[model samples]
Target: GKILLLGPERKWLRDFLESFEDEVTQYQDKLDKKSAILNNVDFIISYGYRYIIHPDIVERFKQRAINLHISYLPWNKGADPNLWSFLEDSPKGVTIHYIDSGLDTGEIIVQREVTYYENDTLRTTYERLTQTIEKLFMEYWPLIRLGKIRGIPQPKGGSYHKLKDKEKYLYLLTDGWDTPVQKLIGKAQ
Candidate 1:
C-alpha cells in the first residue's frame, strides 16, 4: 500500500512515484532489521542510497525490492561503477534490477547501453548516465509494480571494482570528477 525509498530525497524520483498516488517515505540510514517501518510497504527502492538494506529486508520484499544502477552490469558491479566503465572499457550503460543480498549482482529487470561522444568528460558522462538510469526506471516501473515483469540472471563474464581499485589512477582525476574520460582509457594497467 506504500513505498519506502532508500537514499537521498530526490524530487524527480518522488514526483514520479507521486504521479501514481502511492504514499512514499524516504530513509537514508541503516534500516532496522525488524522494524514496523516496513509494515504496509509494498515495495522498497534504492537509488543513490548509501547503506545497504538489511538482508532480512531484502528477503522480506523479494522481487519487490529494487535498485537503479549506473552501469551496464555485470560490468562494473560495485563502487564507482560509472568511472570503472571507462577505465576498464567495459560496456557503458544503466540497469534497474532486483536487489539481492549480493552487491549489484541481482537479477536484471531492464537495462540500456550508452555510448558517448568524443568530447565527453567524466562530468558529461556522469550527467548522461544518471539521467539515463532515472529515465530507464521511470519507463519500466509501472510494469514492474504490476508484477508483469521478472528479472533474469546476468550473463557470465563481467567485472567488479572497489573504491581502492582507483588508487593507481586517482591522480588521473586531474580535473576532479570533471576530468575527460578519454584520459583514463586503459590506464589501469
Candidate 2:
C-alpha cells in the first residue's frame, strides 16, 4: 500500500515528496466530512493535524493509517506535545503509529529519539521533531513497501494526556509546574 498525505496543508511537503518517486496529494478536505479522500486512499499519513477524524471517518482507515506523533506514543497523545515534554523533563521524539479511533492509541510503526540541550526551547524541539519524522519516512518507505516491516502494538506506558490551556498565569503557576512558561505562550491574549 502506498502512502497518502493528510494533515494541516503544507506546500513544502507537497514539493519535497514530489521529488521522491511517489504520488503526493494535498487535501484541503476535512477528514470529518465524507470527502473523496476517504474513499480513494488505502492508508493515511497524518502529520501536524489538529482536527479529530470523527469516529466514522476514523473507522474507515483505522488500522491502515499512520500519524507522526510529536512525542512518544501513549505519553504525548494529544495537543501541546512539545510543551508536555518541556514540563516533564522527559525525553521527547517522533513516533509513526497506526491510527485507531482513539486519540493516538494505535499500533506503533517507528519512533525516532530526540535530544534537547539545556538551552532548548519548544520551537526548537518542534522543529527537530519535524525533521525526525521526515528522516524516518525517507529511511522507512522502502522497508514498508517490500513487506520488511510490520506495525508493533504500542506498549502500555505513561498516562493518556491532552493539552490543558494555561488559561491564565495562575493555572500553570500551581504545583506540578516545572518549566518556565514563556511569555509567547500567552501572546494571543
Candidate 3:
C-alpha cells in the first residue's frame, strides 16, 4: 500500500514530505484528483487535511477514505473540534470515521475517550488528543487496509453544531473572561 501525503503546501510540511521514503505533495486544491488517486491506491490516510471530502471523492473511495475527527460525533462537526471540546469543558477525544457528504456525520470506525485533567488547557489537551488519535490511526490503518473492520452506522438524526461566533471569539481574546468564557466553562469550571 503506497501513501500519498497530501496537506497544505507549507514549506515546513513540504520539506518534511521530502524526507519521507515515498510521498508526493499536492496542495489542498488538488484534492479534486482524489478520485483518480483512490482508483489506483489501496487506502487514503488524511492526517491534517484542511478540507472536507466532497461527495465525488467520498463516493469514489467510500470506505477507503478515512479521517480523524477531533471530537465525538454530532458535537464538533466542523472547525477545530478539539478547541471546541476543551473550551466547552467537554471531554476531549478523537473519532476515526469514513468520509461522507454530511460533515462529521460519518460511519464511526473507531473512537476513544480523552480525559481532561485540572491542568488541561485548550492547547495542551488538544496536543494530547491529537497524539492519541494518531496512535489509533497507526493501529487501525492496517485493519482498514485489510478490510478487517466494518464501521457502525452513526445514529439517526444527529444535529450539526454551528461554527463559533466571531464576536464570541473576539470576546475570548479581548475580554478573555466574559460571556464567551461562561459559555465555554458552563458549570464545569
Candidate 4:
C-alpha cells in the first residue's frame, strides 16, 4: 500500500506509482485522522507532506516509513530545502531517508548530489531535484521493499530551518542562485 502527498508538479510521480500493482492511497490532509487506512500497509512513502507524522504512527511503522526530501541532509533540514540551499550556500542534493519523529532528521537510506547550472533559476533547480529524487527512489525501491535498506545516522553538525525563514529569500526565484550570493556581497548586476 501507499500514501502519497503530491502537489501539482508531482503528478508525474503519482502516475509512476499508479503503474505499480499496489493499492496506492493518495491524500492531502492529516494521516492521524485516517489511521485505519494504513492497517495493511507494507510501507509508506511521503513527499511534500504539509503535516508531521505523529511519533505514535512512526512507532507503528518503524523503519517502514520513508520520506523523499529535496535536500542534502545535515543542512537545509526543514521546509524550503531547495530555497535554503541556494540562499544559505549549503550543499544541494536529495536524501531518501527513514521518517522519524524529528523533522527530516531521520537516518538516510540513499542520497545523491545535485548540481546547479549557470542558467538555472530557482524553478529549474527545484524541478531537477524533484526528478533526481524520483530516480534515486526507483533505483533503491527493490532493496527498500525487501527491508534490506539500512540507514546511516546523520552526523551532528546539520542545521535546521524554520518555515518562517523562507520568505526572506523568495527573491532568489527570479535572481538565480549565484546572483543572490553575489548581491549579498555587493555584486548585484
Error of 2 at 155 (Å): 1.8
Query: Candidate 3: how large is its RMSD?
Result: 4.6
lDDT agreement with native, every candidate = 0.88, 0.67, 0.62, 0.74
Q: What would the per-residue lDDT of candidate 1 be over residues 1-189, giving only the tens digit for each residue?
A: 598999999998888898899989999888898888888899999998888788888888899899999989789988898788888888899999999987888899999999898888988898999989988898999998889999998766689877788888889999888888888887764
Number of the top candidate by TM-score?
A: 1
Report the Cα lDDT for residue 27, model 4.
61
lDDT of 4: 0.74
Instruction: Encode model 2's per-residue lDDT on 1-189: one tens digit a residue.
Output: 345787766776666566665667655445655676666665667887767767776677666667778787767677777666555545578888878877888888888788766655556667778888888877785665455777888877754555554344334543323433352343423
TM-scores for all candidates? 0.96, 0.77, 0.74, 0.83
lDDT of 3 at 60: 68
Q: Is candidate 1 or candidate 3 better by lDDT?
A: 1
Cα misplacement distance, residue 184 of candidate 1 (Å): 0.4
**C-alpha root-mean-square deviation, each candidate:** 1.1, 5.4, 4.6, 3.6
Among the numbered candidates, top lDDT falls to: 1
Give the winner by TM-score: 2 or 3: 2
Off by over 4 Å in 4: 1-15, 18-20, 171-189
lDDT tens digits, residues 1-189, model 3?
444555554554344434444354354544664456544554555656776666776676678777777777656667767556645556457889887776767788998888766644555666777778877776776577678997898765523445553345544534332233333554322
